[PDB]
UniProtKB/TrEMBL annotation, chain F:
Chlorophyll a 4 binds at E35. It comes from Chlamydomonas reinhardtii. The lineage of its organism: Eukaryota, Viridiplantae, Chlorophyta, core chlorophytes, Chlorophyceae. GO terms for cellular component: photosystem I reaction center. Keywords: Membrane, Photosynthesis, Photosystem I, Transmembrane, Transmembrane helix. It is a multi-pass membrane protein. Belongs to the PsaL family. GO terms for biological process: photosynthesis. Transmembrane segments: none annotated. Chlorophyll a 2 binds at Y16, H40. Residues 1-126 form the Photosystem I PsaL reaction centre subunit XI domain. It is found in: Membrane. This is Photosystem I reaction center subunit XI, chloroplastic.
UniProtKB/TrEMBL annotation, chain J:
The chain holds residues 68 to 104 of 106 of the full protein. May help in the organization of the PsaL subunit. This is Photosystem I reaction center subunit VIII. The lineage of its organism: Eukaryota, Viridiplantae, Chlorophyta, core chlorophytes, Chlorophyceae. Belongs to the PsaI family. It is found in: Plastid, Chloroplast thylakoid membrane. It comes from Chlamydomonas reinhardtii (Chlamydomonas smithii).
Amino acid sequence: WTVPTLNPDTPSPIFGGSTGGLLRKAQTEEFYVITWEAKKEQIFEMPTGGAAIMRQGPNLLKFGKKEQCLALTTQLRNKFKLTPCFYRVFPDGKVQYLHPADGVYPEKVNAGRVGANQNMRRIGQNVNPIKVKFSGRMMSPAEI
Amino acid sequence: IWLSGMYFHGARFSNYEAWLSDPTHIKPSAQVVWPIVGQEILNGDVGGGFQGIQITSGFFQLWRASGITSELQL
Amino acid sequence: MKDFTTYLSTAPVIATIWFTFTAGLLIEINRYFPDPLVF
Amino acid sequence: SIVIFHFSWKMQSDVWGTVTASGVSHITGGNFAQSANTINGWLRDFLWAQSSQVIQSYGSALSAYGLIFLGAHF
Amino acid sequence: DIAGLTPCSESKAYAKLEKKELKTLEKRLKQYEADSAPAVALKATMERTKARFANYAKAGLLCGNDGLPHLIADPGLALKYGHAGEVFIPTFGFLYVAGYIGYVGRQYLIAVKGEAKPTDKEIIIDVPLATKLAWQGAGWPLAAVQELQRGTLLEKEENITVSPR
Amino acid sequence: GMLETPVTSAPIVATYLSNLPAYRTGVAPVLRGVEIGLAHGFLLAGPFIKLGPLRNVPETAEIAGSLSAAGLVLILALCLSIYGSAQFQSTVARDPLFSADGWSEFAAGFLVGGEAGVAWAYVCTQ
Amino acid sequence: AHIVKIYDTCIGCTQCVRACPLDVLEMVPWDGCKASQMASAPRTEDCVGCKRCETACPTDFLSVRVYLGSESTRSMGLSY
Amino acid sequence: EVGPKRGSLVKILRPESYWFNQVGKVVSVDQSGVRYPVVVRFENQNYAGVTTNNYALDEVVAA
Amino acid sequence: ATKLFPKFSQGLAQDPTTRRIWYGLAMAHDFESHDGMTEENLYQKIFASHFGQLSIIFLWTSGNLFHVAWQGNFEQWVTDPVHIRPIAHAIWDPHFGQPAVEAFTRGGASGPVNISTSGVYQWWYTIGMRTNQDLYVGSVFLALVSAIFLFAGWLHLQPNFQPSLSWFKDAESRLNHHLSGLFGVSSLAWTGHLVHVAIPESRGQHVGWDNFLSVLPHPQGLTPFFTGNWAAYAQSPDTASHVFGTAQGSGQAILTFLGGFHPQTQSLWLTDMAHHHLAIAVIFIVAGHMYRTNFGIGHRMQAILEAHTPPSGSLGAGHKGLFDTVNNSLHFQLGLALASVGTITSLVAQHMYSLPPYAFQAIDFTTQAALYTHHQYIAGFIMCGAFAHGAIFFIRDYDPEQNKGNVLARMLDHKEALISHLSWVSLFLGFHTLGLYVHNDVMQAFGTPEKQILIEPVFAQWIQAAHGKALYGFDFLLSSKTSAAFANGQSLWLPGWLDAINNNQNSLFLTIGPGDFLVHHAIALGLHTTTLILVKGALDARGSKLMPDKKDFGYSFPCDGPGRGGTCDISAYDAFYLAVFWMLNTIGWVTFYWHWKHLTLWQGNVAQFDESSTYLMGWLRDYLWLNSSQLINGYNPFGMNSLSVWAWTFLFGHLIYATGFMFLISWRGYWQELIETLVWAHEKTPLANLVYWKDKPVALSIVQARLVGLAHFSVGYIFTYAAFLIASTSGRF
Amino acid sequence: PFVPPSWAPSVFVPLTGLVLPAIAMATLFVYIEKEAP
């Protein structure tokens, strides 16, 4: 498996437009682009409000935050049994692949994933805040 | 059941017949309380030789508009 | 009849009957013994 | 609540009242046009002035209303 | 007597209040007939008022400057001046009925806790068991004292859940 | 994507907005400020003159209204200056108005234009 | 950014990962349970703090915890 | 054979557990070297509506 | 990009929303949560903050003195302090019309002024102030003191002047110096002022800085003090015909213990107050030599704490390790200090209304009411803060390893029993007090006032009889003429005290009845419920069954999410939050009782309160509806008077309270969605999208919403009651 | 003497009410929005 590359010249689903789309953040900070493959033309619900028609083949959409892209991914996976993927696009043109990060969905275990933020103890074994006091900043006992 | 109760109260525990002969002085009343724990004070002097609670639902005016003149009809 | 008695044994019906009995007892006591302030 | 308050004050001030010889006397004396333009007028002439009947209703047939008036505040 | 109060049988404000109540009742009665329902009801209310005032004065209650009865809650003063019927005897009466209710409820919970579905018995009351426990609860103080003396009234600290401190 | 309607897509309203001084994109910011300030001070002098506390007394209603409008123009100029100082701190063609020097010159032009508009509205009622 | 931590009481039921609405958690191989999997949080910069993962955790006490930390555009879920 | 007998009643010793100092029935005990092999089922559900949990060998006592 | 504000939090400086400004303003004094904060730096910042606070206090006092000396009528009020109203300061407002100008022009001034209700006129008159020059000099002196304190605060932050961490932990030295110097020496100096200035000025003799070295406070001149004949200072006191401020009827004594009140000023004797300060000065100075600092003698508080464990083990380890958990925790010390200060503030309110210390203070009804209400509300807020800091101590500074088996750990060991019993007491008090009230209301409504339950407060009346009141007829202790306690004080202080307590025209142990009993139970209910909420929040601060790891989330956090059934308002901060409402309700009940009893007392009809305080309808009609008639008539369509400012403040408080209900009922989500729609509207609007925000607009956080709603609730509550109390008391008298 | 002039309120009240708060609000607003280097 290899990381996919965003194709900016990808057809978008048939939508008449809405007022819940992108804002100035997309032009000044970042935005997100979701792409998927549809077996047939089908009407789905847009996470920003309204009903759009996904075309047969590739489909590309833009959203203001990652939650909208994942909500659309969940809707396409649970209802139409599709496999969507999204990226984070910056105004300079940089594209960053986001989900599924390793090509496999995170709900199923995949080899090569290194565990992060894992504490080899339980909650009851956490120390008291007094032992964490006078640190660099506000730190919780779970951070150590 | 609620409407039947309103008609029954107007036919057995009211002063509608007395109010018909003097609707400008007698206060409409269709609820009487039992003489217990000193609550009988709520049975005010509404007029027409009757003691009770002055009702504001307007059933007396509605019954007068329908032509009801006796408690038997209610 | 067994199901009906079981329905009557439910918490709201039992509470209604018990409170009606208790209220009736207190009301009858205050009716036959009006204005009781001290023993 | 503001709607029913306006209705009560307007009816008691410019509509409802008794009829005398060459003149009509209202319940509140026509004080709506002069006092409903301020919040203080609504609090004093409508809420404080008209609540006298419900707070001194004890010992009469309307005492129950006063009791509910307190219970509703609870 | 106690706290500078005077007995209601000698208080002038007490008799004045009785006269005021009878006066307003008589004033309301003056507008009706002599053999009608409101007249009979008002006369019954007047007789009840007279009986209530005479019974309160006969009970030995103490009246203040307002002419209203005042209760004595101190057991020493109540037992020394004959005021135990105000706050002492009703105190023990409430304690008996309240402990009665609490003991019957506790017995019902302990009885249904050893069954298959105690929650089912909690929503659908077992009337025969509840009636039997309600009748057997008359000896609640003796039974409670016996349970406390045997150590079966309380639960051990090791069998009660607590927070992680 | 977005919603297009005849209100936001009519060529007449687009030309009207492009003709406004704020959307000129190519003139000096001080001139834009002078024009906007004059257009604002002229209309601002009205409410204080006809509704202020001294609106019934003669020969001083216009004086008090114009002074109040001048004070409001001064407050708005201070607001424009602090907005420019807190908005442009670092980093078609780029409009020079959206810059520290451009916005400062715009605020100064707005102050001069607003005071001139207030003074012109005062003498226009005499 | 918020702090998301996984504890050793995790049974690898993958319910927290399926309930995450911004793809913050994932499953990694492990040997401390029957499922041979463990939850992980390698993308905490995208966590908003909805605590849906804590709602989906069946262990007593929870195996995943979210401590609200610094707030940014991503953590506040702002689309503007 | 390690751990309590299946079907027996045990007391939970985990302080942060909802069923601390409570009695639960033993369902199964894992024979591997897992941290929490004992499976305990309880009659009363916790705040999350769960009635079962996993505990270590030293976190449960035969009571 | 990263903003400069706030400089103490790097995480907040990186926040691109409007939440950064709000959180930077609300976390400025939480030095423990600042970036790179150490213990030594923490103590140094607190030291500087203390100096700044003293500077602000002294500047405020100098401001009050300056305004009374400039725009007041102190020179005219001293001549006739019975019929002249004190002036706070002048009023300069261009919004005032002509009728408002002549309406506020009163008190003998030449323009609109404010009538002071703080009582500084009576206090300054009693301590010796007579002219405006004295107030001017005092104002300049306090301004100089304020500047000196501010400079001290700035100086103790610079190098070579920052105290070390070890200096801040010298508890024995600090306690010795505070007891002997800050308390004893200050009281001794105050005794010197009363003996040298206040007492001679009350006798018509001017004693100022120009002649205090040539004027003797006593005609015997320090000889009886050195020879031990101290009784010579109590000879020839002020008679019953003494006129305050003149030499008619004045005496020569400087240290007496006559007791009671002055027959004219209806206040405590100046000689008695001087003697009081001298005795407490000696006691505090002696107490200041208890701890060991540098001379071998004295105590070590650690030894006394460690040697105080019961032998049977009832208290476990006792107080072992309590010295370290208190000295190393600033929240523990702050909680103890706030608890003691709140109790002392309540004590001040009670003693000040019952035993007026300043001349002509009892006649000023508005001053008495305002002072009592002010101190009681301040005390309630301070008490809530004491418990809040106790919860903060449990979360941030409590160490179970160091406090193992001592009383502190045992409190958390049985916290369920404490919370359950507090709940039972509150439930019993609420059920019975409300039941008796509703019963009396039903009896009064049905026309049978003799059927209401009126329990006589025999215990409090018994105590009043023990103090000397013979109205109830118990005749024991001070009430009996043949008791040892009565005969042992007949030559020192019992005559004046008995004459004052048996007088029904003052506030010294007022006559009580069933209404007082019922309202006292309401007060008990309020105290127990507020204590239950605060204690439960402090004990459950480290965790509970719902949140076993609550201590890992800090003292204040929004919630733990909707999981596990829902965890709204689970933090200790939320417990304090809910307790503030109960504190306001409790102080409202105590101030309502105080104001109604004193209003009926001053009006000459105590029977009105005695007969209407037994039912809630009497409280709503005879106290709230009846006393607000003049208040709401401050401005009407026919004109206005000087009382219109209180009417405006009344409506102002109602508006603030109602505005608080908005932040209290509606929550974040709705507002965040609405703000998002507003963001879209601003971004799509021409001629307005050219102006953009620097911080992204977001709705207020859950914790911030609670704080804002509570602040509005409290502000509206305070302003509404203050306006009503001042307007009713001033208009009636 | 320390007595202020008769015109002192007519100058200090407008100052403390409009000039000083405007300057303080402007300086504080510029300080809050200043970006760190």
